[PDB]
Design a protein around this nucleic acid. Structure first.
Length: 224
RNA sequence: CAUGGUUGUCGUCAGCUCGUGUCGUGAGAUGUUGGGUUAAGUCCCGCAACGAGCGCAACCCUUAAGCUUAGUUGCCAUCA
């Protein structure tokens, strides 16, 4: 559950953002400033972390899944790797506006993937007009790009893991509309009230994203 | 100038809309905007939009060249 402090300042977790870009609601979680950068208090960080850790093992033991998001490029592979580690579902590309609120139309497109995998094996990708061969292939690749990691999600996820709340604000709006708890990693200049389980950690360092989402992946691993 | 049916017209112009979702107290908006491109909301990239339908293509006829079948009532090369 707890992460050693040195594992954080080695991962750049203490790093925040410039004083220029600062949300004054982070003043509770900020510990002084270095080189004009608001250094996050690692103690507070760890504390908050080991509390979304117990909530997440609760979700995995109940049977719920966590929708990993983090379309940000620095979080892209970190989200993908640790979600499949836990058998959860991840988002790595453009968050489809209304994939949770408008699941009615998204459900057909999600099942379109498994449907598109079907015509290949039932033989109508073998008999096809020349342009339709690539046309239906193009429809596949678009869908794999977005609904690649959530193709097995059937209903609304019982939990959602946001890497950067400010970046993927479109996902948080859907979650709050359907009462979906969010575990989020806030660096600075982010709203700590738009999410419920707050991780005060750096959001740009490549290893910092990996280290915290792995512990959150460890949370599910100790629940299933 | 009660109408069915049929027709011109803008104009073969490329637009016209819908479902679910989202924003807006509301009329309304989005998608149908932006970066390019096309004869074409034609197509791509992105984007609170995700998908559709009537539209535009294509599909259908004729034409332009070729190959099989066919030899009359078509044709006339090898020959009289």
């Amino acid at each position: 559950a707890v992460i050693s402090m040195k594992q954080l300042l080695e991962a750049g977790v203490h790093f925040g953002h410039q004083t220029r870009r600062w949300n004054p609601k982070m003043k509770k979680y900020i510990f002084t400033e270095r080189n004009g950068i608001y250094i996050i208090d690692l103690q507070k960080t760890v504390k908050k972390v080991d509390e979304a850790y117990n909530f997440l093992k609760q979700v995995s033991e109940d049977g719920g899944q966590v929708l990993f998001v983090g379309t940000k490029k620095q979080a892209q592979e970190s989200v993908k790797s640790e979600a499949e580690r836990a058998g959860q579902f991840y988002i790595n590309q453009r968050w489809l506006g209304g994939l949770l609120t408008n699941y009615k139309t998204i459900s057909k497109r999600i099942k379109r993937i498994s449907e598109i995998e079907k015509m290949e094996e039932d033989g109508l990708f073998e008999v096809l007009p020349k342009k339709e061969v690539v046309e239906l292939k193009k429809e596949y690749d678009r869908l794999i790009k977005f609904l690649g990691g959530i193709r097995d999600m059937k209903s609304m996820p019982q939990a959602l893991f946001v890497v950067d709340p400010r970046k993927e604000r479109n996902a948080i709006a859907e979650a709050r509309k359907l009462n979906i708890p969010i575990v989020g990693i806030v660096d600075t200049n982010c709203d700590p009230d738009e999410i419920d389980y707050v991780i005060p950690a750096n959001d740009d360092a490549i290893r910092a994203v990996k280290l915290l989402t792995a512990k959150m992946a460890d949370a599910i691993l100790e629940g299933q």
